[PDB]
């Protein structure tokens, strides 16, 4: 009965579902595809970054921003809103680092951002988030990887994806843990992070793209989040071209 | 955050506030409860109910002590009773006890709990409380005294009264059994007996909670050696005690 249940978000529809928050998932679907392979060594992020026209500048724009010095945060959905969730954890981590004098754990960080994205679903004065982030890194508790839904829900993962090509990415990571049962180093895992983005560009084969790959690994960068670049990258690209032919 | 600063208790077009009436509706769904004011005590009785028989009702309080002389009993919402018992305790101590050194008279505490009702009709973003309380008590100046606080925010002194789902039957039975003089043993004998024509589940001392604000006890005071202080006049009766008196109906 009644009319509505979609005008506010601190209503609950009768089924037991939400709205707006239920609708915000469709918003993340309009984004690009972005993957994370949790390696034994670390994590390797990669993101499909669309190139619309040649008017834009290549390798000069990013969807991989660092948080702290040892956490990649890479996001899909509505990009300013996704950048606000990255902004928020830069503040959060700096306070923790002031307060307790240690690099902020990944499991601590996972709790912190989670509470905030949950927090916007509890008032009608602010809008629910319409982005999903895939974040992880290397801290001293080992390598960890997380995906955080705009629902305010997050879980452990060893492979994640979100955006348009989440069907092909989810399935091709299933294949990736089932190739390798004892796992793989991050140096090899750069090459798979390229392959499954190119396979998730067949959902976006009306467009052309530039590939950004980044890593945080214990022993390839000493546990520090950097960008993959140069000669190592051009090799990941070549592997991926052959794989889709 | 907040962005509500306008009432949702509003007058209807033919008069009468819509919201204070609805709130009074939620009370008559709830349990049946009664209070009988005698010449030497006040007895109150209520019926205890649980989710399931695996739920205990011995760790749930449907009778509370506000001060050592003034107790409470409700018909209505459990949750609303919970918060409204705590805020009363806090205001009983902070808005009189510190300053005047003794616990508030029964009238005076009643008056205070009535403004809390009022600020949940008035002030933005809130809806009324959904309990009607009986607040029975004893003070030195009104003798024993019985009041009924309602969601409206008004109180009425009674001689004996009922609230709940059996309220109409209860008060017709109470009309014929209130007498000018009632002894404390007689008062208990009417209150269990009224509540028994308003029970259709189990009848045992573990399902019937009874509390007297009889006469004073120098055995629940916790000390001896100050004769000024005379202990709790409030005394909740355990399940066994109530049960002896059920076999003696």
């Amino acid at each position: 009965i009644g009319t509505g249940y979609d005008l506010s978000n601190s209503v609950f529809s009768p089924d037991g579902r939400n709205f707006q928050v239920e609708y915000a998932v469709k918003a993340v679907e309009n984004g690009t595809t972005s993957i994370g392979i949790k390696c034994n060594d670390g994590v390797v992020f990669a993101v499909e970054k669309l190139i619309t026209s040649k008017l834009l500048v290549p390798q000069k724009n990013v969807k991989i921003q660092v948080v702290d010095r040892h956490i990649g945060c890479v996001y899909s959905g509505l990009i300013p809103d996704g950048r606000h969730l990255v902004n928020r954890g830069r503040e959060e981590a700096a306070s923790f680092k002031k307060l307790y004098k240690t690099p902020i754990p990944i499991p601590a960080f996972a709790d912190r951002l989670g509470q905030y994205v949950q927090a916007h679903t509890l008032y009608n004065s602010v809008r629910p988030f319409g982005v999903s982030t895939i974040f992880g890194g290397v801290d001293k508790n080992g390598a960890h990887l997380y995906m955080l839904e705009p629902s305010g829900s997050y879980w452990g993962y060893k492979g994640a994806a979100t955006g348009k090509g989440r069907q092909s990415a989810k399935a091709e990571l299933e294949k990736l843990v089932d190739h390798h049962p004892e796992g793989l180093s991050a140096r090899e895992a750069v090459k798979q992070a390229a392959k499954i983005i190119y396979l998730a560009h067949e959902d976006n084969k009306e467009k052309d793209f530039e590939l950004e790959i980044s890593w945080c690994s214990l022993s390839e960068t000493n546990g520090l989040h950097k960008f993959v670049k140069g000669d190592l990258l051009q090799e990941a690209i070549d592997f991926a071209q052959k794989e889709i032919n | 955050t907040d962005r509500y600063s306008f009432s949702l208790t509003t007058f209807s077009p033919s008069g009468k506030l819509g919201q204070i009436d609805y709130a009074l509706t939620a009370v008559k769904q709830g349990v049946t409860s009664l209070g009988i004011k005698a010449t030497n005590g006040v007895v109150i009785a209520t019926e205890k109910k649980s989710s399931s028989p695996l739920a205990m009702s011995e760790t749930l309080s449907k009778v509370s002590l506000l001060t050592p002389d003034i107790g409470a009993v409700y018909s209505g919402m459990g949750p609303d009773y919970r918060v409204l018992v705590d805020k009363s305790r806090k205001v009983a101590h902070t808005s009189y006890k510190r300053i005047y050194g003794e616990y508030p008279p029964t009238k005076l505490l009643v008056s205070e709990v009535a403004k809390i009702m009022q600020e949940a009709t008035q002030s933005g973003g809130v809806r009324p409380f959904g309990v009607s309380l009986l607040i029975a008590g004893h003070d030195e100046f009104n003798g024993f005294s019985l009041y009924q606080v309602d969601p409206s925010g008004s109180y009425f002194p009674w001689k004996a009264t009922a609230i709940g789902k059996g309220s109409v039957a209860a008060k017709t039975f109470l009309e014929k059994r209130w007498n000018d003089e009632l002894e404390l043993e007689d008062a208990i004998h009417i209150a269990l007996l009224t509540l028994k024509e308003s029970v259709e589940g189990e009848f045992n001392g573990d399902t019937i909670e009874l509390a007297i604000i009889g006469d004073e006890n120098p055995d629940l005071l916790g000390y001896t050696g100050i004769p000024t202080d005379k202990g709790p006049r409030f005394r909740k009766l355990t399940s066994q005690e109530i049960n002896d008196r059920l076999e003696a109906l």
């Binding site: - | 300053i99 005047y100 050194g101 003794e102 008279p105 009238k107 005076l108 008056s111 030195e140 100046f141």
Partner: protein
């Protein structure tokens, strides 16, 4: 100098059997100069009597403060406040202004209507309830009062033995003190009947 000796003032209070009496001087000075020989330091809310010593202005401030609080007590609970209940309110009002306090020293004197007992109590600056069933003295001739009062007084007095004792106690400290005296009023408080008797005494 002293913030409670710059206009002086004294209050004496005694109990008897079935009666109390309280009494104050009528001196308001500004230091050395006498300004007035007719300022009261005793006031009455109902049948309770509250004598207030110490700095000139805080006697008056404090009178209108308790005037406010006594009205709200009586209106809600529909009786005149009892001596014992009131003493607790005299303590709390001092303590609220714990820092930079009211530079007074009141005396509560009554006879309870609910038990018929003489009841008296005292306070310092910050206010510590001083029980007694003897007498309580306060002010700037209080060192003298404590000795003088004790010496004459016999435990329990008749209503008009009590007028002769508390009158002499007050006179003799007040003419050995420089900031006290100068006309004085003694009250005899029985059950239901209070007489206010001014005293003939030394003005010089």
């Amino acid at each position: 100098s002293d913030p409670s000796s710059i206009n002086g003032g004294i209050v004496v209070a005694m109990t008897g059997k079935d009666c109390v009496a309280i009494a104050c001087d009528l001196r308001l000075g500004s230091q050395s100069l006498g300004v007035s020989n007719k300022f009261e330091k005793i006031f009455h809310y109902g049948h309770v009597f509250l004598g207030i010593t110490g700095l000139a202005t805080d006697v008056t401030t404090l009178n209108e403060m308790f005037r406010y609080k006594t009205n709200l007590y009586k209106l809600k609970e529909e009786r005149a406040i009892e001596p014992e209940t009131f003493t607790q309110l005299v303590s709390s009002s001092l303590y609220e202004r714990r820092f930079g306090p009211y530079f007074v020293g009141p005396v509560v004197a009554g006879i309870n209507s609910k038990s018929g007992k003489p009841f008296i109590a005292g306070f310092d600056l910050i206010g510590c309830i001083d029980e007694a069933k003897d007498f309580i003295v306060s002010g700037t001739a209080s060192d003298q009062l404590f000795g003088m009062c004790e010496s004459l007084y016999e435990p329990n007095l008749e209503p008009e033995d009590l007028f002769e004792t508390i009158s002499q106690a007050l006179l003799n400290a007040a003419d050995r003190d420089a900031l006290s005296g100068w006309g004085a009023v003694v009250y005899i408080i029985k059950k239901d009947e209070v007489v206010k008797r001014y005293l003939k005494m030394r003005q010089d």
